[PDB]
Design a protein around this ligand. Structure first.
Ligand SMILES: [Pt+4]
Ligand SMILES: [Pt+4]
Length: 129
C-alpha cells in the first residue's frame, strides 16, 4: 500500500509514535517519506547481503528474519515479510525497539541526512490529527 502523507501521520499517531522517545510525529513521517516513499512494499538490498523492508526500511541483519542473512539476529521476532503489510502495526512495533536502542532515529540513514534539523512539522501540516 502507498500511503498518503496525512493518512500515514494519522496511522502513526494512532499506533503511539507521536513523541515516542521524544521524536515528534513529523520526524517519523519524514523518515518514511525518504526511506520508502510511503510504500509499505519497498525492499532494498544492502552490499553486505542484508535487505531493508517496508515503510521504515528495517534491516534483516538485526531486526527481522528473512531466511537469507547468515548470522542475522531477529530482534523484533518477526518474519521480514510481516513488515511489508498494508497494516503498519508490525513496522511500528519494531521501529519502537530500534529507536530505543541507544542511537535514537540516527539508526535511519535518510532521517539523519534528510530530516534531522529540518522543519519536520511541515510533514504534518494541514493534517486532521
Ligand atoms: Pt493494493
Ligand atoms: Pt486509520
Amino acid at each position: 500500500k502507498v500511503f498518503g502523507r496525512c493518512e500515514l501521520a494519522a496511522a502513526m499517531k494512532r499506533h503511539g509514535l507521536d513523541n515516542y522517545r521524544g521524536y515528534s510525529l513529523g520526524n517519523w513521517v519524514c523518515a518514511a517519506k525518504f526511506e520508502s516513499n510511503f510504500n509499505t512494499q519497498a525492499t532494498n538490498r544492502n552490499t553486505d547481503g542484508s535487505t531493508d523492508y517496508g515503510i521504515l526500511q528495517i534491516n534483516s541483519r538485526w531486526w527481522c528474519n528473512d531466511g537469507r542473512t547468515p548470522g542475522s539476529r531477529n530482534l523484533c521476532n518477526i518474519p521480514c515479510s510481516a513488515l511489508l503489510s498494508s497494516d503498519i502495526t508490525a513496522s511500528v512495533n519494531c521501529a519502537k525497539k530500534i529507536v530505543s536502542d541507544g542511537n535514537g532515529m540516527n539508526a535511519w540513514v535518510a532521517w539523519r541526512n534528510r530530516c534531522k534539523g529540518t522543519d519536520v512539522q511541515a510533514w504534518i501540516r494541514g493534517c486532521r490529527l
